[PDB]
């Protein structure tokens, strides 16, 4: 074979590993000051608690136990079945069964627990790509996360992906049997401890636009694992926190705010260290004085010992005056970071009893920030995940066959998909605004048929199978 | 035998014991500053009280006395019985009897009391695996918890488990009779005191994908205990607090926040030690002065003694100035840890009378954190537990036989499963939104049949056996 | 400049008079609750004590922070 792997994947991995190195060190920097174990352990938990809340508060809105995508009938299909109501009813029933299948798959296949780490890592790193390869209908298809450190990607100036490579080091103890043999014959006498790196390369076929995979184990192949992928659906997904116009990767959310994060840690730790000095009781006996250490060190309470106070002092550094200046600043940054990590208690920074309304106003800002990040993250990670899972399930045919109208639907996400839809809110607000013109349903020179429409128009309902057609209006008026 | 135990389990235990050693020391560190007896006794209880609340507050939502899983009819089975209502009713009745069986089993078999320690340990340690081996319908099947220290596990880069080993040291006084003989018929005259380590090895059969067990007692076997396990259902469960992309184990929740926990202990204990010094009354008599200790030490109140005040002083270290600097920081960390241990009283950190609303906002952040951790922990520990118990009970046939439609159901957990379902909330909100279009049930040119659907669509009800079918609509209109 | 300033205020440096009896080693190593030979006068700490200027800087940083915020 040739193409983009003219001489293996390792070669392509090393070539891109130089473009990735800035993002990689940036990610390790962010991790150090927040929670390091995502790339020893820091002097504050402020950043840590923030990142934790940011992941929680994100996924609980993005990936809750509620159904959070709604498949809508394709526009042409909707048009083709116009005002054929029994069928359209059954179609929604069909896709809204699909709604449940993928969800009941996700909750059982343990996608959520990994998507947590995915968001955590996607926040501190900027990129963190996901494999959901083998449905294997019978058993667990666990999701697999490849953190920024142990993978690499290349893109074109548009956004499209050409080639990605992922390294996995497992030590030959926990290898599948096909590679265990393809390894121990070409290599040496291996042990469970040693450690083997299995690269994985995906090209874009340079004419028949489709992704091709193979698995390299030291300038070799797996002698079996190589499979194909269409461009539209690839079970190998590279997400992106904070896009850039070109490049290949994306910016850690927790970067622009690090300027202060670093400022806080290197200060916080000095304060903690300072406190540890203030707390230390050391007693300075004048060796020229009469008061001798032992008689005190051993003396219990209520005693009387020979000596005067002047022979003894205690360290008493008394630099509160500086401390208060350091603290007053540590809290000022802690507050700014708090607001930047969606952390309620941005509202309370001591002072006075912040009154009841400048809470629900500061709240609206925090909700705006989370909502903006939510919409981007939702739109980018949420839809690629759904589109891939939909195609995978259609291929295995765990989707008991549908009518023609539900082979290619559209994929509403976020609010619309859960109960509290705005489609709905528009619908019910119109119905009530229709109840409004009851006191003139017996209209002397007032045309309800027209108003009843213009209202639904301004609100923006479909008005399809709603306003009884001129013919159906006249037909029903006689009954 | 051979496979993954080419020469016993002890060998595999020792090989993996080196990969486990970092997690193990990390766990002992966490424990030291929280509650140490989970791996002498510390100077503060803050962390202790936090871990306690964290376990309580978790399990009370995860594992309450209420029924907290609901088995739903498999999707194909639902489709196959579409609009056959008497049967579907009876099906729900059937699984909702299964709902009660497993629960009545769990409450009687004392699962909750162990699952407490499981969560406590899973919080401080990162992993803590669970055995629920023998149903023994007649009596107690107690749950068995193997703490991180006395077990070990290996995984593949996917999540799947290959081999686990558990050590149990009991001293030959409390051994079953088969090992008691298989032990003293190899190794020595043994007393009730001595102490015997029984290892326990589980392979993945390297072609007929199924878990195989045996029980080793010193490079030997139990001569009986060896049994098999299918891959889908193993009564040997390894949970995971905070996943990692690879490895084998998981991260203690109480790790990233330790950075401050350690900082607090080593300070707190200095303060306590400082206080004990401040409280100590030592009286310094000048031996050159006239005032003599005896006369005072023995003198009662209201007396008059010969001497002047200048001959006597008291220790008076007077380093409040430093203390206030130390305290002001101890409380600042105490507050950040409190928030990180779901501890209400995160809201009150003295200052002023925190007003009425920036409580229910700081609450929403604490509920979000607990809710996120809950969803992961629920999804990971809750569903593996249920799936295992369901299969075990089906095998012993304590599940009086069901129709074909309830051999492989789906397993809803969390909110859906208890009364307050979102499925329910959507249903009732639609029904009321339908009551909304009563003032136009006598519709002049307004099609209710269509609106009454589109509402249930936007909300996301099934609409199955709800909107009377075109034929059933026309059939009932004549009656 | 404030962040930098704080970093200076936080820094604990202890000035032993080399003419005095109180010697660094015995303190640096001494744990809490101890007694060491020497007097307080031989030792001080840096104590820059320019809060007076800080407060003037802060009161202005926050005034601009407020206008930018809006």
Numbering used by the authors:
A (entry chain C), B (entry chain D): 5 to 43, 55 to 494
C (entry chain B): 285 to 354
From the paper:
Phage portal proteins are key viral components located in a single pentameric vertex of the capsid and they act as initiators of capsid assembly. They are also critical components of the DNA-packaging complex and are involved in tail assembly. Here we report a number of crystal and high-resolution cryo-electron microscopy (cryo-EM) structures of the T7 bacteriophage portal (gp8). The structures show two conformations—open and closed—of the portal and suggest a possible mechanism of the channel valve that regulates DNA passage.
The gp8 monomeric structure was then used for phasing the gp8-12mer 3.6 Å resolution crystallographic data (gp8closed, see Methods section), which yielded an atomic model of the dodecameric portal. The overall shape of the T7 portal protein shows a ring-like assembly formed by 12 subunits and with an axial central channel. The external diameter of the particle is 170 Å, whereas its height is 110 Å. The diameter of the channel (measured between opposite Cα atoms) is 23 Å at its narrowest section, which would hinder the passage of a B-DNA molecule. Regarding the shape of the portal central channel, there are two cavities, “upper” and “bottom”, with a conical and an inverted conical shape, respectively, separated by the protrusion of α10 toward the center of the channel. The electrostatic potential of the protein is markedly negative, both on the external and inner surfaces, except for the exterior of the clip and the tunnel loop, due to R368. The tunnel loop, a singular feature also found in other portal particles, is between α9 and α10, and only partially observable in the gp8 dodecameric structure due to its intrinsic flexibility. Therefore, two clearly different conformations in the T7 connector were defined: one closed (gp8closed) and the other open (gp8open). Although the first structure described in this work (gp8closed) would impede the DNA passage through it, the second structure (gp8open) would allow it. The closure of the T7 portal protein, as observed here, does not allow the passage of the genome and therefore the portal valve is likely to be in the open conformation during DNA packaging.
